[PDB]
Protein backbone atom coordinates (compact mmCIF):
# COMPACT_ATOMS: atom_id res chain seq x y z
CA UNK A 1 0.00 0.00 0.00
CA UNK A 2 1.35 3.44 -0.95
CA UNK A 3 -0.33 4.90 2.15
CA UNK A 4 1.55 2.66 4.60
CA UNK A 5 4.91 3.40 2.95
CA UNK A 6 4.13 7.12 3.09
CA UNK A 7 3.28 6.61 6.77
CA UNK A 8 6.51 4.72 7.44
CA UNK A 9 8.74 7.21 5.61
CA UNK A 10 7.21 10.10 7.57
CA UNK A 11 8.08 8.28 10.77
CA UNK A 12 11.57 7.57 9.45
CA UNK A 13 12.06 11.21 8.45
CA UNK A 14 10.96 12.35 11.92
CA UNK A 15 13.22 9.82 13.65
CA UNK A 16 16.30 10.64 11.54
CA UNK A 17 15.87 14.44 11.79
CA UNK A 18 16.06 14.56 15.59
CA UNK A 19 19.43 15.68 17.01
CA UNK A 20 22.19 13.35 18.11
CA UNK A 21 21.23 11.50 21.34
CA UNK A 22 25.42 6.91 25.49
CA UNK A 23 22.24 6.52 23.42
CA UNK A 24 23.78 6.28 19.94
CA UNK A 25 23.68 2.47 19.67
CA UNK A 26 20.06 2.34 20.86
CA UNK A 27 19.11 5.04 18.33
CA UNK A 28 20.90 3.14 15.56
CA UNK A 29 19.03 -0.10 16.27
CA UNK A 30 15.81 1.95 16.40
CA UNK A 31 16.50 3.38 12.95
CA UNK A 32 17.53 -0.04 11.62
CA UNK A 33 14.21 -1.50 12.78
CA UNK A 34 12.29 1.13 10.82
CA UNK A 35 14.49 0.86 7.71
CA UNK A 36 14.26 -2.95 7.61
CA UNK A 37 10.49 -2.83 8.06
CA UNK A 38 10.27 -0.51 5.05
CA UNK A 39 12.77 -2.61 3.08
CA UNK A 40 10.88 -5.85 3.75
CA UNK A 41 7.71 -4.19 2.41
CA UNK A 42 9.33 -3.07 -0.87
CA UNK A 43 10.56 -5.00 -3.89
CA UNK A 44 14.32 -4.39 -3.77
CA UNK A 45 15.92 -2.48 -6.63
CA UNK A 46 13.24 -0.86 -8.77
CA UNK A 47 15.18 -1.80 -11.93
CA UNK A 48 17.10 -5.05 -12.36
CA UNK A 49 18.77 -6.47 -15.45
CA UNK A 50 18.27 -9.87 -17.03
CA UNK A 51 21.97 -10.65 -17.53
CA UNK A 52 24.90 -11.22 -15.22
CA UNK A 53 26.95 -8.08 -14.86
CA UNK A 54 29.72 -9.60 -16.98
CA UNK A 55 27.20 -10.10 -19.80
CA UNK A 56 27.22 -6.29 -20.12
CA UNK A 57 30.99 -5.65 -20.18
CA UNK A 58 31.18 -5.98 -24.01
CA UNK A 59 28.59 -3.18 -24.27
CA UNK A 60 30.71 -1.10 -21.86
CA UNK A 61 33.80 -1.54 -24.05
CA UNK A 62 32.00 -0.81 -27.32
CA UNK A 63 30.32 2.29 -25.88
CA UNK A 64 33.57 3.57 -24.36
CA UNK A 65 35.44 2.77 -27.59
CA UNK A 66 33.01 4.73 -29.78
CA UNK A 67 33.40 7.75 -27.47
CA UNK A 68 37.20 7.83 -27.54
CA UNK A 69 38.23 5.78 -24.51
CA UNK A 70 41.07 3.24 -24.41
CA UNK A 71 39.69 -0.28 -24.72
CA UNK A 72 42.74 -2.35 -25.69
CA UNK A 73 45.30 -4.07 -23.47
CA UNK A 74 43.14 -5.23 -20.55
CA UNK A 75 40.12 -7.43 -19.80
CA UNK A 76 37.52 -7.55 -17.03
CA UNK A 77 38.03 -10.35 -14.49
CA UNK A 78 36.09 -11.30 -11.35
CA UNK A 79 38.86 -11.57 -8.74
CA UNK A 80 37.99 -13.29 -5.45
CA UNK A 81 39.78 -10.73 -3.28
CA UNK A 82 38.71 -7.41 -4.82
CA UNK A 83 35.72 -8.37 -6.99
CA UNK A 84 35.73 -7.35 -10.63
CA UNK A 85 38.77 -5.52 -11.94
CA UNK A 86 41.07 -5.00 -14.89
CA UNK A 87 43.71 -7.54 -15.91
CA UNK A 88 46.56 -6.80 -18.33
CA UNK A 89 46.44 -8.68 -21.64
CA UNK A 90 49.92 -7.39 -22.58
CA UNK A 91 52.88 -6.11 -20.62
CA UNK A 92 52.24 -2.57 -19.40
CA UNK A 93 55.28 -0.64 -18.22
CA UNK A 94 55.26 1.69 -15.24
CA UNK A 95 54.34 5.26 -16.29
CA UNK A 96 52.82 4.18 -19.62
CA UNK A 97 49.63 6.11 -20.41
CA UNK A 98 47.45 3.02 -20.86
CA UNK A 99 43.93 4.18 -19.88
CA UNK A 100 41.98 7.32 -20.85
CA UNK A 101 38.30 8.34 -20.60
CA UNK A 102 36.91 11.45 -22.38
CA UNK A 103 34.51 13.69 -20.47
CA UNK A 104 31.58 12.68 -22.71
CA UNK A 105 31.49 9.33 -20.89
CA UNK A 106 31.40 10.80 -17.39
CA UNK A 107 28.36 11.23 -15.17
CA UNK A 108 28.81 14.59 -13.45
CA UNK A 109 26.84 17.10 -11.40
CA UNK A 110 26.58 19.04 -14.67
CA UNK A 111 25.13 16.09 -16.60
CA UNK A 112 22.75 15.54 -13.67
CA UNK A 113 21.74 19.21 -14.05
CA UNK A 114 20.93 18.73 -17.74
CA UNK A 115 19.08 15.41 -17.39
CA UNK A 116 15.48 14.58 -16.51
CA UNK A 117 16.56 15.36 -12.93
CA UNK A 118 17.16 18.98 -14.03
CA UNK A 119 13.87 20.51 -12.85
CA UNK A 120 13.89 18.88 -9.39
CA UNK A 121 17.59 19.80 -9.12
CA UNK A 122 16.96 23.50 -9.71
CA UNK A 123 14.36 23.60 -6.89
CA UNK A 124 15.65 21.28 -4.13
CA UNK A 125 18.07 22.90 -1.68
CA UNK A 126 19.78 19.61 -0.82
CA UNK A 127 20.48 18.66 -4.46
CA UNK A 128 21.96 22.11 -5.10
CA UNK A 129 24.19 21.97 -2.03
CA UNK A 130 25.39 18.36 -2.31
CA UNK A 131 26.75 17.12 -5.62
CA UNK A 132 27.29 13.64 -4.18
CA UNK A 133 23.56 13.24 -3.48
CA UNK A 134 22.83 14.80 -6.89
CA UNK A 135 25.14 12.22 -8.51
CA UNK A 136 23.23 9.48 -6.64
CA UNK A 137 19.83 10.54 -8.01
CA UNK A 138 21.40 11.10 -11.45
CA UNK A 139 22.49 7.46 -11.41
CA UNK A 140 19.04 6.27 -10.26
CA UNK A 141 17.13 8.25 -12.90
CA UNK A 142 19.42 7.07 -15.70
CA UNK A 143 19.30 3.51 -14.35
CA UNK A 144 15.51 3.59 -14.64
CA UNK A 145 15.64 5.12 -18.17
CA UNK A 146 16.02 2.28 -20.70
CA UNK A 147 17.53 4.53 -23.40
CA UNK A 148 19.98 6.46 -21.20
CA UNK A 149 23.31 7.26 -22.83
CA UNK A 150 24.96 5.74 -19.71
CA UNK A 151 23.19 2.34 -19.67
CA UNK A 152 26.36 0.43 -20.71
CA UNK A 153 28.00 1.87 -17.60
CA UNK A 154 25.02 1.40 -15.28
CA UNK A 155 24.41 -2.22 -16.33
CA UNK A 156 28.04 -3.13 -15.45
CA UNK A 157 27.93 -1.60 -11.94
CA UNK A 158 27.62 -3.91 -8.89
CA UNK A 159 24.20 -4.62 -7.43
CA UNK A 160 25.48 -4.64 -3.82
CA UNK A 161 28.39 -3.24 -1.80
CA UNK A 162 30.19 -3.79 1.50
CA UNK A 163 29.71 -0.29 2.84
CA UNK A 164 28.37 -0.57 6.43
CA UNK A 165 24.91 0.31 5.07
CA UNK A 166 24.80 -3.39 4.06
CA UNK A 167 26.13 -4.78 7.37
CA UNK A 168 23.99 -6.88 9.67
CA UNK A 169 23.35 -5.51 13.15
CA UNK A 170 25.73 -8.07 14.66
CA UNK A 171 28.44 -7.11 12.15
CA UNK A 172 28.23 -3.45 13.23
CA UNK A 173 28.07 -4.55 16.89
CA UNK A 174 31.74 -5.63 16.70
CA UNK A 175 32.56 -1.90 16.41
CA UNK A 176 31.02 -0.87 19.73
CA UNK A 177 33.46 1.33 21.74
CA UNK A 178 35.48 2.37 18.63
CA UNK A 179 35.88 5.74 16.95
CA UNK A 180 34.66 4.41 13.60
CA UNK A 181 31.25 3.23 14.81
CA UNK A 182 30.04 6.83 15.27
CA UNK A 183 30.70 7.46 11.59
CA UNK A 184 28.88 4.21 10.85
CA UNK A 185 25.94 5.54 12.90
CA UNK A 186 25.99 8.87 11.05
CA UNK A 187 26.10 7.25 7.60
CA UNK A 188 23.12 5.04 8.44
CA UNK A 189 21.09 7.96 9.86
CA UNK A 190 22.00 10.36 7.02
CA UNK A 191 21.02 7.73 4.46
CA UNK A 192 17.71 6.86 6.14
CA UNK A 193 16.87 10.57 6.55
CA UNK A 194 17.78 11.30 2.93
CA UNK A 195 15.69 8.39 1.65
CA UNK A 196 12.59 9.48 3.59
CA UNK A 197 13.04 13.17 2.71
CA UNK A 198 13.46 12.54 -1.01
CA UNK A 199 10.66 9.95 -1.04
CA UNK A 200 8.25 12.64 0.18
CA UNK A 201 9.76 15.36 -2.03
CA UNK A 202 9.39 13.21 -5.16
CA UNK A 203 5.73 12.61 -4.30
CA UNK A 204 4.95 16.33 -3.73
CA UNK A 205 7.11 18.21 -6.21
CA UNK A 206 5.73 18.89 -9.72
CA UNK A 207 9.34 18.92 -10.94
CA UNK A 208 9.60 15.19 -10.13
CA UNK A 209 6.55 14.24 -12.23
CA UNK A 210 8.52 12.88 -15.20
CA UNK A 211 11.09 11.06 -13.06
CA UNK A 212 10.76 7.25 -13.17
CA UNK A 213 11.33 7.43 -9.40
CA UNK A 214 7.85 8.95 -9.01
CA UNK A 215 6.40 5.47 -9.66
CA UNK A 216 9.04 3.44 -7.80
CA UNK A 217 11.73 4.57 -5.36
CA UNK A 218 12.77 2.02 -2.74
CA UNK A 219 15.12 2.28 0.19
CA UNK A 220 17.17 -0.34 -1.68
CA UNK A 221 17.35 2.06 -4.66
CA UNK A 222 18.81 4.80 -2.47
CA UNK A 223 21.22 2.59 -0.54
CA UNK A 224 22.56 1.27 -3.86
CA UNK A 225 22.78 4.75 -5.38
CA UNK A 226 24.68 6.40 -2.52
CA UNK A 227 26.92 3.35 -2.14
CA UNK A 228 27.69 3.43 -5.87
CA UNK A 229 28.64 7.11 -5.53
CA UNK A 230 30.66 6.89 -2.33
CA UNK A 231 32.70 3.88 -3.50
CA UNK A 232 33.49 5.29 -6.99
CA UNK A 233 33.09 9.10 -7.28
CA UNK A 234 35.86 11.57 -8.14
CA UNK A 235 36.65 15.26 -8.07
CA UNK A 236 37.59 16.67 -11.49
CA UNK A 237 37.77 20.21 -12.88
CA UNK A 238 34.83 21.64 -14.77
CA UNK A 239 35.23 22.03 -18.52
CA UNK A 240 36.33 25.68 -18.10
CA UNK A 241 38.91 24.61 -15.50
CA UNK A 242 37.43 27.25 -13.16
CA UNK A 243 35.69 24.97 -10.64
CA UNK A 244 35.77 21.42 -9.30
CA UNK A 245 32.85 19.04 -9.65
CA UNK A 246 32.02 15.43 -8.76
CA UNK A 247 32.06 12.68 -11.38
CA UNK A 248 31.68 8.96 -11.99
CA UNK A 249 34.37 7.78 -14.41
CA UNK A 250 33.40 4.67 -16.42
CA UNK A 251 35.85 1.89 -17.28
CA UNK A 252 38.75 3.44 -15.32
CA UNK A 253 36.82 3.15 -12.07
CA UNK A 254 37.00 -0.67 -12.40
CA UNK A 255 40.64 -0.59 -11.23
CA UNK A 256 41.05 -1.93 -7.71
CA UNK A 257 43.29 -0.41 -5.02
CA UNK A 258 46.90 -1.07 -4.09
CA UNK A 259 49.54 0.87 -2.17
CA UNK A 260 51.45 3.57 -4.03
CA UNK A 261 50.92 7.07 -5.48
CA UNK A 262 48.11 8.73 -7.43
CA UNK A 263 48.83 8.19 -11.14
CA UNK A 264 45.45 9.27 -12.55
CA UNK A 265 44.97 12.92 -13.51
CA UNK A 266 42.60 15.05 -15.52
CA UNK A 267 43.88 16.40 -18.85
CA UNK A 268 42.02 19.67 -19.39
CA UNK A 269 43.50 20.36 -22.84
CA UNK A 270 42.14 17.09 -24.26
CA UNK A 271 39.25 16.88 -21.76
CA UNK A 272 39.80 13.36 -20.51
CA UNK A 273 40.87 11.40 -17.47
CA UNK A 274 44.29 9.84 -18.01
CA UNK A 275 45.82 6.97 -16.02
CA UNK A 276 49.52 6.00 -16.20
CA UNK A 277 50.60 2.60 -14.89
CA UNK A 278 51.46 2.70 -11.18
CA UNK A 279 53.95 -0.16 -11.68
CA UNK A 280 54.83 -2.71 -14.34
CA UNK A 281 51.91 -5.03 -15.09
CA UNK A 282 52.75 -8.30 -16.84
CA UNK A 283 50.14 -9.89 -19.06
CA UNK A 284 47.94 -11.85 -16.68
CA UNK A 285 48.44 -9.42 -13.77
CA UNK A 286 45.66 -7.35 -12.25
CA UNK A 287 45.97 -3.64 -13.01
CA UNK A 288 45.79 -1.61 -9.80
CA UNK A 289 45.72 2.08 -9.01
CA UNK A 290 46.32 3.94 -5.74
CA UNK A 291 42.95 5.41 -4.72
CA UNK A 292 44.34 8.03 -2.33
CA UNK A 293 45.79 8.49 1.16
CA UNK A 294 42.66 7.50 3.12
CA UNK A 295 42.38 5.80 6.50
CA UNK A 296 40.99 2.31 6.96
CA UNK A 297 37.94 3.86 8.61
CA UNK A 298 37.40 5.76 5.36
CA UNK A 299 38.08 2.68 3.20
CA UNK A 300 35.54 0.69 5.26
CA UNK A 301 32.83 3.31 5.57
CA UNK A 302 33.06 5.03 2.18
CA UNK A 303 34.84 2.45 -0.02
CA UNK A 304 33.49 -0.80 1.42
CA UNK A 305 36.76 -2.59 2.13
CA UNK A 306 39.56 -2.89 4.65
CA UNK A 307 43.04 -2.51 3.18
CA UNK A 308 45.71 -4.55 4.96
CA UNK A 309 48.97 -2.68 5.52
CA UNK A 310 47.40 0.66 4.70
CA UNK A 311 50.43 2.87 5.33
CA UNK A 312 48.20 5.97 5.58
CA UNK A 313 46.02 4.60 8.37
CA UNK A 314 45.18 6.93 11.23
CA UNK A 315 42.84 7.57 14.15
CA UNK A 316 41.36 10.82 15.40
CA UNK A 317 42.33 12.51 18.65
CA UNK A 318 40.45 15.53 19.99
CA UNK A 319 42.56 18.12 21.82
CA UNK A 320 42.02 21.69 22.98
CA UNK A 321 43.32 24.29 25.38
CA UNK A 322 40.85 24.54 28.27
CA UNK A 323 39.48 27.89 29.41
CA UNK A 324 40.31 26.71 32.95
CA UNK A 325 44.00 26.95 31.92
CA UNK A 326 45.68 29.92 33.62
CA UNK A 327 47.63 30.53 30.37
CA UNK A 328 44.61 30.11 28.08
CA UNK A 329 44.63 33.54 26.44
CA UNK A 330 48.37 33.41 25.74
CA UNK A 331 48.16 29.87 24.35
CA UNK A 332 45.13 30.73 22.22
CA UNK A 333 46.93 33.76 20.79
CA UNK A 334 50.06 31.77 19.94
CA UNK A 335 47.92 29.09 18.29
CA UNK A 336 46.03 31.78 16.37
CA UNK A 337 49.29 33.35 15.21
CA UNK A 338 50.43 29.89 14.07
CA UNK A 339 47.11 29.41 12.25
CA UNK A 340 45.91 26.63 14.57
CA UNK A 341 42.52 26.52 16.35
CA UNK A 342 42.40 26.40 20.12
CA UNK A 343 40.46 23.10 19.89
CA UNK A 344 40.23 20.61 17.03
CA UNK A 345 40.34 16.97 15.97
CA UNK A 346 43.87 15.91 15.03
CA UNK A 347 45.11 12.57 13.69
CA UNK A 348 47.46 9.92 15.07
CA UNK A 349 49.26 8.15 12.22
CA UNK A 350 50.36 4.55 11.86
CA UNK A 351 53.60 5.48 10.09
CA UNK A 352 56.24 7.23 12.20
CA UNK A 353 56.20 10.02 13.20
CA UNK A 354 52.79 9.47 14.84
CA UNK A 355 51.89 13.18 14.74
CA UNK A 356 51.89 15.87 12.05
CA UNK A 357 53.64 19.24 12.13
CA UNK A 358 50.34 20.88 13.07
CA UNK A 359 49.77 18.49 15.97
CA UNK A 360 53.37 18.82 17.17
CA UNK A 361 52.94 22.60 17.09
CA UNK A 362 49.69 22.36 19.05
CA UNK A 363 51.25 20.07 21.68
CA UNK A 364 54.25 22.35 22.18
CA UNK A 365 52.00 25.36 22.78
CA UNK A 366 49.72 23.22 24.95
CA UNK A 367 52.68 22.42 27.26
CA UNK A 368 54.49 25.78 27.15
CA UNK A 369 55.37 27.73 30.27
CA UNK A 370 54.42 31.40 30.50
CA UNK A 371 57.98 32.50 29.69
CA UNK A 372 58.04 30.27 26.61
CA UNK A 373 54.69 31.71 25.47
CA UNK A 374 56.03 35.26 25.89
CA UNK A 375 58.88 34.38 23.53
CA UNK A 376 56.34 33.39 20.84
CA UNK A 377 54.35 36.61 21.36
CA UNK A 378 56.81 39.46 21.88
CA UNK A 379 59.91 40.82 20.23
CA UNK A 380 61.96 40.51 17.11
CA UNK A 381 62.29 36.70 17.23
CA UNK A 382 58.67 35.79 18.06
CA UNK A 383 57.69 35.27 14.42
CA UNK A 384 60.72 33.05 13.81
CA UNK A 385 59.65 30.92 16.77
CA UNK A 386 56.09 30.63 15.43
CA UNK A 387 57.56 29.49 12.11
CA UNK A 388 59.46 26.54 13.61
CA UNK A 389 56.65 25.45 15.94
CA UNK A 390 55.81 22.43 13.76
CA UNK A 391 59.44 21.49 13.10
CA UNK A 392 60.67 18.56 15.16
CA UNK A 393 64.26 19.67 14.51
CA UNK A 394 63.76 22.86 16.59
CA UNK A 395 62.24 22.29 20.03
CA UNK A 396 61.10 25.15 22.22
CA UNK A 397 63.00 23.53 25.14
CA UNK A 398 63.92 20.01 26.20
CA UNK A 399 61.44 20.34 29.06
CA UNK A 400 58.63 21.28 26.65
CA UNK A 401 59.37 18.14 24.62
CA UNK A 402 59.41 15.84 27.65
CA UNK A 403 56.09 17.32 28.79
CA UNK A 404 54.32 16.97 25.42
CA UNK A 405 55.51 13.42 24.74
CA UNK A 406 54.56 12.44 28.29
CA UNK A 407 51.12 13.95 27.66
CA UNK A 408 50.74 12.09 24.36
CA UNK A 409 51.87 8.76 25.81
CA UNK A 410 49.35 9.03 28.68
CA UNK A 411 46.52 10.15 26.41
CA UNK A 412 47.10 7.40 23.84
CA UNK A 413 47.30 4.91 26.74
CA UNK A 414 44.07 6.30 28.17
CA UNK A 415 42.38 5.94 24.77
CA UNK A 416 43.50 2.30 24.55
CA UNK A 417 41.62 1.68 27.82
CA UNK A 418 38.29 2.73 26.27
CA UNK A 419 37.95 -0.29 23.92
CA UNK A 420 35.83 -3.26 24.93
CA UNK A 421 38.46 -5.76 23.69
CA UNK A 422 42.23 -5.91 23.70
CA UNK A 423 44.49 -6.26 20.66
CA UNK A 424 45.17 -9.87 21.66
CA UNK A 425 41.49 -10.77 21.94
CA UNK A 426 40.94 -9.27 18.48
CA UNK A 427 43.72 -11.42 16.99
CA UNK A 428 42.22 -14.41 18.79
CA UNK A 429 38.77 -13.72 17.33
CA UNK A 430 40.29 -13.44 13.85
CA UNK A 431 42.28 -16.66 14.29
CA UNK A 432 39.58 -18.84 15.88
CA UNK A 433 36.23 -17.71 14.40
CA UNK A 434 35.03 -18.22 10.83
CA UNK A 435 33.71 -14.81 9.76
CA UNK A 436 32.05 -13.04 6.85
CA UNK A 437 33.93 -10.46 4.76
CA UNK A 438 31.91 -7.69 6.46
CA UNK A 439 32.50 -9.00 10.00
CA UNK A 440 36.22 -9.32 9.26
CA UNK A 441 36.23 -5.70 8.05
CA UNK A 442 34.71 -4.61 11.37
CA UNK A 443 37.10 -6.61 13.57
CA UNK A 444 40.17 -5.61 11.56
CA UNK A 445 39.01 -1.99 11.80
CA UNK A 446 38.67 -2.10 15.60
CA UNK A 447 42.00 -3.92 15.87
CA UNK A 448 43.65 -1.31 13.64
CA UNK A 449 42.49 1.59 15.85
CA UNK A 450 44.11 0.00 18.89
CA UNK A 451 47.30 -0.91 17.02
CA UNK A 452 47.68 2.72 15.90
CA UNK A 453 47.21 3.85 19.51
CA UNK A 454 49.69 1.27 20.81
CA UNK A 455 52.28 2.35 18.24
CA UNK A 456 51.70 5.96 19.34
CA UNK A 457 52.25 4.98 22.99
CA UNK A 458 55.59 3.32 22.17
CA UNK A 459 56.71 6.18 19.91
CA UNK A 460 55.91 8.86 22.52
CA UNK A 461 57.65 6.81 25.23
CA UNK A 462 60.79 6.61 23.07
CA UNK A 463 60.63 10.36 22.36
CA UNK A 464 60.14 11.15 26.06
CA UNK A 465 63.32 9.22 26.90
CA UNK A 466 65.33 10.79 24.07
CA UNK A 467 64.38 14.29 25.21
CA UNK A 468 64.84 13.51 28.90
CA UNK A 469 68.38 12.40 28.03
CA UNK A 470 69.08 15.71 26.27
CA UNK A 471 67.71 17.48 29.34
CA UNK A 472 69.77 15.54 31.90
CA UNK A 473 72.94 15.93 29.82
CA UNK A 474 72.15 19.66 29.31
CA UNK A 475 72.50 19.33 25.54
CA UNK A 476 72.73 22.62 23.63
CA UNK A 477 69.36 23.55 22.19
CA UNK A 478 69.31 23.66 18.37
CA UNK A 479 69.04 27.19 17.00
CA UNK A 480 67.15 28.27 13.91
Amino acid sequence: SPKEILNLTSELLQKCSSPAPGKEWEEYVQIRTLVEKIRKKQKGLSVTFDGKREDYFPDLMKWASENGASVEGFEMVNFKEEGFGLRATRDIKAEELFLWVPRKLLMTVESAKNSVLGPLYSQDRILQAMGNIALAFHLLCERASPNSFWQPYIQTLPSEYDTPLYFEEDEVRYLQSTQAIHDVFSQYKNTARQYAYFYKVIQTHPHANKLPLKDSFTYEDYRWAVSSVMTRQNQIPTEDGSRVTLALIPLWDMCNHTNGLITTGYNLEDDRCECVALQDFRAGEQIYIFYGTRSNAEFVIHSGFFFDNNSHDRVKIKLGVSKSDRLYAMKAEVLARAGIPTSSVFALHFTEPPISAQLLAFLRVFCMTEEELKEHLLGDSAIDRIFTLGNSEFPVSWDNEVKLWTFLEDRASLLLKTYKTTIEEDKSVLKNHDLSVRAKMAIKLRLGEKEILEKAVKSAAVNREYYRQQMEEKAPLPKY
Binding site: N132, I133, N190, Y197, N234, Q235, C273, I289, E298
Partner: peptide, 17 residues
Protein backbone atom coordinates in the same frame (compact mmCIF):
# COMPACT_ATOMS: atom_id res chain seq x y z
CA UNK B 1 49.81 15.98 -11.81
CA UNK B 2 47.76 19.14 -12.24
CA UNK B 3 44.37 17.54 -11.46
CA UNK B 4 45.05 14.29 -9.58
CA UNK B 5 41.97 12.06 -9.51
CA UNK B 6 41.24 10.25 -6.24
CA UNK B 7 39.08 7.13 -6.77
CA UNK B 8 36.24 7.25 -4.23
CA UNK B 9 37.31 10.59 -2.69
CA UNK B 10 35.50 11.09 0.61
CA UNK B 11 32.69 13.66 0.65
CA UNK B 12 30.41 15.01 3.36
CA UNK B 13 27.01 13.25 3.31
CA UNK B 14 25.58 15.09 6.36
CA UNK B 15 22.82 17.27 4.93
CA UNK B 16 22.06 18.75 8.36
CA UNK B 17 25.51 20.29 8.84
Amino acid sequence: LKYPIEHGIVTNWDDME
